[PDB]
Design an enzyme around this catalytic site. Structure first.
Site, PDB file in Angstrom:
ATOM      1  N   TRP B  16     -36.919  -5.893-101.193  1.00 47.21           N
ATOM      2  CA  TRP B  16     -37.740  -4.708-100.803  1.00 47.21           C
ATOM      3  C   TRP B  16     -39.306  -4.632-101.677  1.00 47.21           C
ATOM      4  O   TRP B  16     -39.550  -4.785-102.924  1.00 47.21           O
ATOM      5  CB  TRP B  16     -37.332  -3.469-101.201  1.00 47.21           C
ATOM      6  CG  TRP B  16     -38.322  -2.364-101.123  1.00 47.21           C
ATOM      7  CD1 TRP B  16     -39.217  -1.828-102.017  1.00 47.21           C
ATOM      8  CD2 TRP B  16     -38.256  -1.493 -99.931  1.00 47.21           C
ATOM      9  NE1 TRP B  16     -39.794  -0.875-101.329  1.00 47.21           N
ATOM     10  CE2 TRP B  16     -39.351  -0.557-100.246  1.00 47.21           C
ATOM     11  CE3 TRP B  16     -37.852  -1.290 -98.629  1.00 47.21           C
ATOM     12  CZ2 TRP B  16     -39.573   0.465 -99.342  1.00 47.21           C
ATOM     13  CZ3 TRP B  16     -38.209  -0.410 -97.685  1.00 47.21           C
ATOM     14  CH2 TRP B  16     -39.046   0.536 -98.042  1.00 47.21           C
ATOM     15  N   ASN B  18     -43.075  -2.189-101.043  1.00 48.91           N
ATOM     16  CA  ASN B  18     -43.837  -1.188-100.306  1.00 48.91           C
ATOM     17  C   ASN B  18     -45.202  -1.261-100.816  1.00 48.91           C
ATOM     18  O   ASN B  18     -45.945  -2.318-100.827  1.00 48.91           O
ATOM     19  CB  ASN B  18     -43.029   0.031-100.306  1.00 48.91           C
ATOM     20  CG  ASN B  18     -42.941   0.564-101.780  1.00 48.91           C
ATOM     21  OD1 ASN B  18     -42.040  -0.055-102.469  1.00 48.91           O
ATOM     22  ND2 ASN B  18     -43.277   1.889-102.152  1.00 48.91           N
ATOM     23  N   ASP B  19     -45.720  -0.284-101.367  1.00 48.96           N
ATOM     24  CA  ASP B  19     -47.370  -0.085-101.603  1.00 48.96           C
ATOM     25  C   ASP B  19     -47.978  -1.394-102.136  1.00 48.96           C
ATOM     26  O   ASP B  19     -47.379  -1.741-103.261  1.00 48.96           O
ATOM     27  CB  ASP B  19     -47.489   1.163-102.363  1.00 48.96           C
ATOM     28  CG  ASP B  19     -46.986   2.158-101.925  1.00 48.96           C
ATOM     29  OD1 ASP B  19     -47.138   3.442-102.439  1.00 48.96           O
ATOM     30  OD2 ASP B  19     -46.275   2.436-100.855  1.00 48.96           O
ATOM     31  N   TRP B  43     -35.845   0.533-101.110  1.00 52.49           N
ATOM     32  CA  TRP B  43     -36.692   0.902-102.263  1.00 52.49           C
ATOM     33  C   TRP B  43     -35.735   1.366-103.643  1.00 52.49           C
ATOM     34  O   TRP B  43     -34.671   1.937-103.293  1.00 52.49           O
ATOM     35  CB  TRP B  43     -37.320   2.116-101.555  1.00 52.49           C
ATOM     36  CG  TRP B  43     -38.251   2.899-102.646  1.00 52.49           C
ATOM     37  CD1 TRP B  43     -39.519   2.474-103.048  1.00 52.49           C
ATOM     38  CD2 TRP B  43     -37.909   4.104-103.384  1.00 52.49           C
ATOM     39  NE1 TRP B  43     -40.083   3.418-104.019  1.00 52.49           N
ATOM     40  CE2 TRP B  43     -39.203   4.259-104.285  1.00 52.49           C
ATOM     41  CE3 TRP B  43     -36.835   4.794-103.675  1.00 52.49           C
ATOM     42  CZ2 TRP B  43     -39.106   5.442-105.385  1.00 52.49           C
ATOM     43  CZ3 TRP B  43     -36.794   5.795-104.632  1.00 52.49           C
ATOM     44  CH2 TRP B  43     -38.071   5.972-105.509  1.00 52.49           C
ATOM     45  N   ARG B 144     -48.846  11.917-107.965  1.00 56.28           N
ATOM     46  CA  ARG B 144     -48.970  10.462-108.210  1.00 56.28           C
ATOM     47  C   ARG B 144     -50.058   9.505-107.465  1.00 56.28           C
ATOM     48  O   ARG B 144     -50.796  10.317-106.626  1.00 56.28           O
ATOM     49  CB  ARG B 144     -47.524   9.972-107.493  1.00 56.28           C
ATOM     50  CG  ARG B 144     -47.241  10.393-106.381  1.00 56.28           C
ATOM     51  CD  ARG B 144     -45.834   9.698-105.888  1.00 56.28           C
ATOM     52  NE  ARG B 144     -45.670  10.292-104.452  1.00 56.28           N
ATOM     53  CZ  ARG B 144     -44.790  11.448-104.126  1.00 56.28           C
ATOM     54  NH1 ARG B 144     -44.652  12.159-105.157  1.00 56.28           N
ATOM     55  NH2 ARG B 144     -44.346  11.757-102.787  1.00 56.28           N
ATOM     56  N   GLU B 199     -50.223  11.249-100.266  1.00 58.29           N
ATOM     57  CA  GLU B 199     -49.955  10.154-101.158  1.00 58.29           C
ATOM     58  C   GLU B 199     -51.024   9.169-100.936  1.00 58.29           C
ATOM     59  O   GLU B 199     -51.816   9.070 -99.776  1.00 58.29           O
ATOM     60  CB  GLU B 199     -48.548   9.415-100.601  1.00 58.29           C
ATOM     61  CG  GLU B 199     -47.315  10.511-100.401  1.00 58.29           C
ATOM     62  CD  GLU B 199     -46.007   9.561-100.401  1.00 58.29           C
ATOM     63  OE1 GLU B 199     -45.291   9.764-101.041  1.00 58.29           O
ATOM     64  OE2 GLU B 199     -45.885   8.847 -99.285  1.00 58.29           O
ATOM     65  N   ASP B 235     -47.009  11.688 -96.323  1.00 58.72           N
ATOM     66  CA  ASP B 235     -45.611  11.994 -96.203  1.00 58.72           C
ATOM     67  C   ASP B 235     -44.835  12.557 -94.853  1.00 58.72           C
ATOM     68  O   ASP B 235     -43.878  11.619 -94.298  1.00 58.72           O
ATOM     69  CB  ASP B 235     -45.155  12.950 -97.167  1.00 58.72           C
ATOM     70  CG  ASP B 235     -44.304  12.746 -98.458  1.00 58.72           C
ATOM     71  OD1 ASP B 235     -43.983  13.377 -99.460  1.00 58.72           O
ATOM     72  OD2 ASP B 235     -43.861  11.483 -98.268  1.00 58.72           O
TER      73      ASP B 235
HETATM   74  O1  LIG Z   1     -42.819   3.435-104.827  1.00 60.44           O
HETATM   75  C1  LIG Z   1     -43.039   4.915-104.752  1.00 60.44           C
HETATM   76  C2  LIG Z   1     -44.577   4.848-104.155  1.00 60.44           C
HETATM   77  O2  LIG Z   1     -44.348   4.998-102.941  1.00 60.44           O
HETATM   78  C3  LIG Z   1     -45.196   6.174-102.285  1.00 60.44           C
HETATM   79  O3  LIG Z   1     -44.302   7.324-101.945  1.00 60.44           O
HETATM   80  C4  LIG Z   1     -46.187   5.679-100.822  1.00 60.44           C
HETATM   81  O4  LIG Z   1     -45.281   4.835-100.142  1.00 60.44           O
HETATM   82  C5  LIG Z   1     -46.104   6.564-103.509  1.00 60.44           C
HETATM   83  O5  LIG Z   1     -46.528   7.758-103.420  1.00 60.44           O
HETATM   84  C6  LIG Z   1     -45.328   6.073-104.561  1.00 60.44           C
HETATM   85  O6  LIG Z   1     -46.141   5.908-105.782  1.00 60.44           O
END
Ligand SMILES: OC[C@H]1O[C@](O)(CO)[C@@H](O)[C@@H]1O
Ligand SMILES: *[C@H]1O[C@H](CO)[C@@H](O[C@H]2O[C@H](CO)[C@@H](O[C@@H]3O[C@H](CO[C@@H]4O[C@H](CO)[C@@H](O)[C@H](O)[C@@H]4O)[C@@H](O)[C@H](O[C@H]4O[C@H](CO)[C@@H](O)[C@H](O)[C@@H]4O[C@H]4O[C@H](CO)[C@@H](O)[C@H](O)[C@@H]4O)[C@@H]3O)[C@H](O)[C@H]2NC(C)=O)[C@H](O)[C@H]1NC(C)=O
Ligand SMILES: *[C@H]1O[C@H](CO)[C@@H](O[C@@H]2O[C@H](CO)[C@@H](O)[C@H](O)[C@H]2NC(C)=O)[C@H](O)[C@H]1NC(C)=O
Ligand SMILES: *[C@@H]1O[C@H](CO)[C@@H](O)[C@H](O)[C@H]1NC(C)=O
EC number: 3.2.1.26
Lengths: 146, 537
Positions: B16, B18-19, B43, B144, B199, B235
């Protein structure tokens, strides 16, 4: 009546209410606690579904069952090994969308696994419906945290 | 074996992602960090993985840069950003999950600045530098994603962190003299009621007329006119939004330009599958560059089974358009080096009503294609319904089998030979109003028949394109096995999509230009290049 209003905004008020009241964490719990209680409820059903699926595979299933029974086994293995643990982590650490992803995952799997059966009543249909319905209530609850 | 893994898009060997995190340039080397689960296809256990590049396309792997190693990040290393300080030193601000699972902001800096690849990072004993507590009253579960910091005229740094209060999204501002002691500003840089969590906030300057990037702390001289861009990932909707406005340095507040509201009604970078995007200033070639995360549109079972989830789109240079009403994005030009030496060219072909023209000799599952369309009879275009305001919903109800005056015309990508499977990236042209000379160009990315497997999320995407149909219509598509990146009107409308065909794989995928509208459209020029594979982490 955080529980009451939380359950008003879900696809099944009664199932929601029954489930949250069965866990004392809901007396004083915020919306994240109520979400975690729902995940437990799904986990409890998905475990039973999983064990049931094992029996029928270790008991000489019909030709039209084998193809479903193997898929269902993998589906519930993903629910119990990937989806729910993820949702528990996301709710506990504060990234609700990954809990939402996990709940939508198990809702579709439960339905999918149910619909693999023709004649359209599986040997553990209640468990699929329970896992489907609880996952949808769970989604609703987590929408609140977005 | 792995027919859906990409040939030139950034993704790890497995697991996995992501960001994108802390994109930067340092000593002529590009860094991409990214959120990565070391032991799964979903995740969790999230750490910062790390890869470096000198072209933004080919990537060398490094050990995890940032991972739990102290109380203040013991339960996870969440997203954040790199800031290049005046002396040239890079620092990273990032969200840690602390021992009570509260979200807190920590600093990291290089262990050895002579190491160009910045493999090892150390963390301050003062961490967390910014945190929720009883005084600020910030919500510990919604706090965050620190931005790159910018140095104000008064020599105090600013940084913003994504947050929310009830249904209200926030960009909480902190200021600092030394970059260690951070103090919360009473009022945030901006907020919005009803949006939900904000976010991955981003905040950067852009020049008013021009395509070059502006350094994040750069001021608007008595000649130079800068707008500012505030971006938030929401979100609620799972999309990325931006507004164009001015930065009131007196108030330390962002004011979107009249017509803009920083919520779900705002414009997007990408109108398809795209989230958690982050820009950085590429000082080497003077350009702002945008990273974006595209998650899978396959089932979680398929993810777990193939053993990986998530890609980055191809990095894209961005800038303000001539009109100042939107941003223009375009894949960084380094991606064009992957283009095979022998291009496939069609010119001056007439796609009559109901026709399709196949493009031969190209690796159709791994290709870059640019096309120009000219319509002859604009006045024959249908009058758009005034209630049809949502472009995605138009694409959903008016599929390619529904004819209109102008369109559907465009490309059919990742298609099987007998079109059992295909992804349509096309245009429709409507007349804005009855007897008008103003026209509406719609862009659709339709993946309703992209795969024979029904488990795939086959949602269709749409976006209006601010271009004059009197002039030729531009359309570019990057194609890469399980991702299609579409750019209408030379970057005014972007639609990333994810598809997972059963037949249209490798040598068995095909590429068509097509037209199912009533009127015929010309194809002035169609260039289709095969794309070589990049060497990626
Ligand atoms: O991995 C967690 C991360 O992913 C998010 O929700 C966005 O996709 C961020 O707000 C957070 O830091
Ligand atoms: C990454 O992860 C996933 C990617 O897969 C993302 O998750 C979500 O992705 C999309 C949102 O883009 C969700 O799509 C929705 O799915 C529903 C389909 O359900 C089944 O599929 C078939 C489809 O043929 C259908 O028979 C049944 O519904 C099945 O149950 C759709 O109901 C829904 O479609 C509606 O909305 C879309 C826009 O999102 C429209 O294009 C459609 O036309 C449709 O509109 C409906 O409402 C309007 C009113 O607004 C009416 O006018 C219409 O007539 C119609 O009734 C949509 O396609 C997907 O469900 C969801 N999946 C998961 C697992 O979460 C996730 O967002 C990504 N995350 C990130 C960070 O990128
Ligand atoms: C987090 O932010 C504030 C922290 O104070 C919360 O605001 C309180 O909300 C509760 C409702 O559960 C009320 O009883 C208090 O009166 C509120 N205080 C203030 C000052 O508004 C807020 O509820 C929390 N999070 C969200 C998402 O609303
Ligand atoms: C720092 O890195 C550079 C280049 O990688 C190297 O020459 C040097 O020896 C390193 N120094 C230390 C103390 O590790």
């Amino acid at each position: 009546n955080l529980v009451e209003t939380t359950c008003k905004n879900t696809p099944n008020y009664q199932l929601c209410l029954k489930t949250l009241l069965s866990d004392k964490r809901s007396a004083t719990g915020d919306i994240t606690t109520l979400a975690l209680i729902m995940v437990d409820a799904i986990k409890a059903k998905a475990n039973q579904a999983a064990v049931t699926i094992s029996k029928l595979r270790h008991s000489n299933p019909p030709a039209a069952w084998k193809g479903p029974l193997k898929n269902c086994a993998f589906s519930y293995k993903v629910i119990l090994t990937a989806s729910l643990p993820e949702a528990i982590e996301a709710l506990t650490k504060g990234d609700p969308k990954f809990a939402e992803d996990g709940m939508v995952g198990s809702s579709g799997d439960a339905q999918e696994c149910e619909e693999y059966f023709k004649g359209s009543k599986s040997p553990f249909s209640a468990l699929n419906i329970a896992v489907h319905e609880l996952s949808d209530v769970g989604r609703a609850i987590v929408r609140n945290l977005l | 074996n792995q027919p859906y893994r990409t040939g030139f898009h950034f993704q790890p060997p497995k697991n996995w992602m992501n960001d994108p995190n802390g994109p930067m340039i340092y000593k002529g080397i590009y860094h991409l960090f990214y959120q990565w689960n070391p032991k799964g296809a979903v995740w969790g256990n999230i750490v910062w993985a790390h890869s470096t590049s000198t072209d933004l396309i080919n990537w060398d792997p490094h050990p995890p840069a940032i991972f739990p190693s102290a109380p203040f990040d013991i339960n996870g290393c969440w997203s954040g950003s790199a800031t290049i300080l005046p002396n040239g030193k890079p620092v990273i601000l990032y969200t840690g999950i602390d021992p009570k699972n509260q979200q807190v902001q920590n600093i990291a800096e290089p262990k050895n600045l002579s190491d160009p690849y910045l493999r090892e990072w150390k963390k301050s004993p003062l961490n967390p530098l910014m945190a929720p507590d009883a005084v600020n009253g910030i919500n510990a579960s919604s706090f965050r994603d620190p931005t790159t910091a910018w140095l104000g005229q008064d020599k105090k740094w600013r940084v913003i962190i994504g947050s929310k209060i009830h249904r209200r999204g926030l960009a909480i501002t902190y200021t600092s003299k030394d970059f260690l002691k951070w103090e919360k500003s009473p009022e945030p840089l901006h907020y919005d009621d009803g949006s939900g969590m904000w976010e991955c906030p981003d905040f950067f300057p852009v020049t008013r007329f021009g395509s070059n990037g502006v350094e994040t702390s750069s001021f608007g001289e008595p000649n130079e006119i800068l707008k500012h861009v505030l971006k938030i990932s929401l979100d609620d909707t799972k999309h990325d939004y931006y507004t164009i406005g001015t930065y009131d340095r007196v108030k330390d507040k962002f004011v979107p330009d009249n017509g803009f509201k920083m919520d779900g009604t705002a414009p997007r970078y990408d109108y398809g599958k795209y989230y958690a995007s982050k820009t950085f200033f590429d000082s080497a070639k003077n350009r702002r560059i945008l990273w974006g995360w595209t998650n899978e549109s396959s089932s979680v079972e398929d993810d777990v089974e193939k053993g990986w989830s998530g890609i980055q789109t191809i990095p894209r240079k961005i800038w303000l358009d001539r009109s100042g009403k939107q941003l223009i994005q375009w894949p960084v030009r380094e991606v064009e080096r992957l283009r095979t030496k022998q291009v496939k060219n069609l010119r001056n072909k007439v796609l009559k009503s109901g026709s399709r023209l196949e493009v031969y000799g190209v690796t159709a599952a791994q290709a870059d294609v640019e096309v120009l369309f000219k319509v002859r009879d604009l006045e024959k275009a249908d009058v758009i319904e005034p209630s049809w305001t949502d472009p995605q919903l138009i694409c959903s109800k008016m599929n390619v089998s529904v004819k209109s005056g102008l369109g559907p015309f465009g490309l059919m990508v990742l298609a099987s030979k007998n079109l059992e499977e295909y992804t349509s990236v096309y245009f429709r042209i409507f007349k804005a109003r009855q007897n008008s000379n103003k026209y509406v160009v719609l862009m659709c990315s339709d993946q309703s028949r992209s795969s024979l497997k029904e488990d795939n999320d086959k949602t269709t995407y749409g976006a209006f394109v601010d271009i004059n149909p009197h002039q030729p219509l531009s359309l570019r598509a990057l194609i890469d096995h399980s991702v299609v990146e579409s750019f209408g009107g030379k970057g005014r409308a972007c639609i990333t999509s994810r598809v997972y065909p059963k037949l249209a794989i490798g040598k068995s995928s095909h590429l068509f230009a097509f037209n199912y509208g009533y009127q015929s459209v010309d194809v002035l020029n169609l260039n289709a290049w095969s794309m070589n594979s990049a060497q990626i982490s």
